[PDB]
């Protein structure tokens, strides 16, 4: 996916990669997460690309997904539970919903979930 | 720098009017 | 850096202690003029 203009999430380019990789881990683990609006927007294209690779299903792509999600159990569910679900749907695998601002820092939050 | 004079009441209030919240 | 007060109870009782104040008559005046002024802690 296209890189971000301006400051990277989490204060560094290195933190950003691992931040977005682990958020994708959680999104595939639970199917829906609540997080900051900016983080949700960054995470959508990353997660959608990973689903695209899981659709293909071959061993090569399984390496490629493993470069981002180091967890073999999550990747198993991705290739064997999620990718079959989206076999027919051409893209737009994720849904982003805005919710109210967070208390404490007034950060705009949002829910990102896998489209059923 | 330092404020040269105590700001007159008119000038102070002209500005603080601009520090208002917006109706949601 | 290193400030000008390194506490040490031993060395603060051998310098400003009550025993030291009673040794020199010039020091017993200090003790007496603190008793008359009413201080609580009469010597360090």
């Amino acid at each position: 996916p296209k890189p971000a203009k301006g400051a990277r999430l989490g204060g560094s380019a290195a933190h950003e990669k691992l931040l977005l990789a682990n958020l994708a881990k959680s999104l595939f683990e639970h199917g829906r997460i609540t997080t900051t609006e900016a983080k949700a927007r960054r995470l959508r294209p990353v997660a959608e690309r990973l689903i695209t690779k899981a659709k293909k299903g071959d061993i090569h792509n399984r390496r490629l997904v493993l470069q981002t999600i180091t967890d073999k159990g999550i990747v198993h569910t991705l290739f064997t539970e999620i990718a079959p679900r989206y076999a027919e749907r051409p893209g737009g695998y994720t849904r982003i919903t805005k919710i109210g601002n967070r208390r404490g820092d007034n950060a705009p939050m949002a829910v990102i979930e896998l489209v059923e | 720098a330092v404020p040269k004079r105590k700001m007159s009441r008119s000038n102070t209030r002209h500005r603080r009017s601009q520090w208002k919240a917006a109706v949601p | 850096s290193k400030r000008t007060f390194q506490p040490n109870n031993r060395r603060r009782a051998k310098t400003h202690g009550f025993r030291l104040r009673m040794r020199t008559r010039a020091g017993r005046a200090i003790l007496a003029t603190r008793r008359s002024k009413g201080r609580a802690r009469l010597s360090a």
Binding site: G100, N101, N106 | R16, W19, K20, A21, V23, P24 | -
Partner: protein, 111 residues
């Protein structure tokens, strides 16, 4: 049908409290709750807690149960007893810090 409540010694600076109370002057009582509900400012919490006492007093004390013919007649924030504490800063000096408080009053009347 003037009924009112007020919270005294509410720990929020008067200007920060006025920022929110200046939104809720002269609107329907319920419509004002629906504005303080979705308001980013952190002062909107004590203010809405006082706006609910005013309506509760109107319903109970004066028997005006119907809380839909009410509008905010008066609402103002008064200064309160300031607390004073210090802050160590560069080169051994100290600058004062004032923790200001405020007295929030709200008045609901029948239309």
């Amino acid at each position: 049908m003037e009924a009112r409540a007020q919270a005294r010694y509410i720990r929020v600076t008067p200007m920060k409290a006025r920022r929110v109370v200046d939104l809720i002057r002269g609107m329907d009582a319920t419509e004002a709750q629906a504005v303080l509900r979705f308001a980013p400012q952190a002062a909107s919490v004590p203010v809405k807690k006082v706006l609910d006492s005013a309506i509760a007093n109107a319903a109970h004390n004066y028997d005006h149960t119907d809380a839909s013919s009410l509008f905010i007649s008066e609402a103002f924030v008064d200064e309160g007893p300031t607390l004073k504490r210090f802050r160590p800063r560069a080169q051994g000096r100290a600058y004062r810090i004032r923790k200001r408080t405020s007295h929030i009053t709200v008045v609901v009347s029948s239309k």
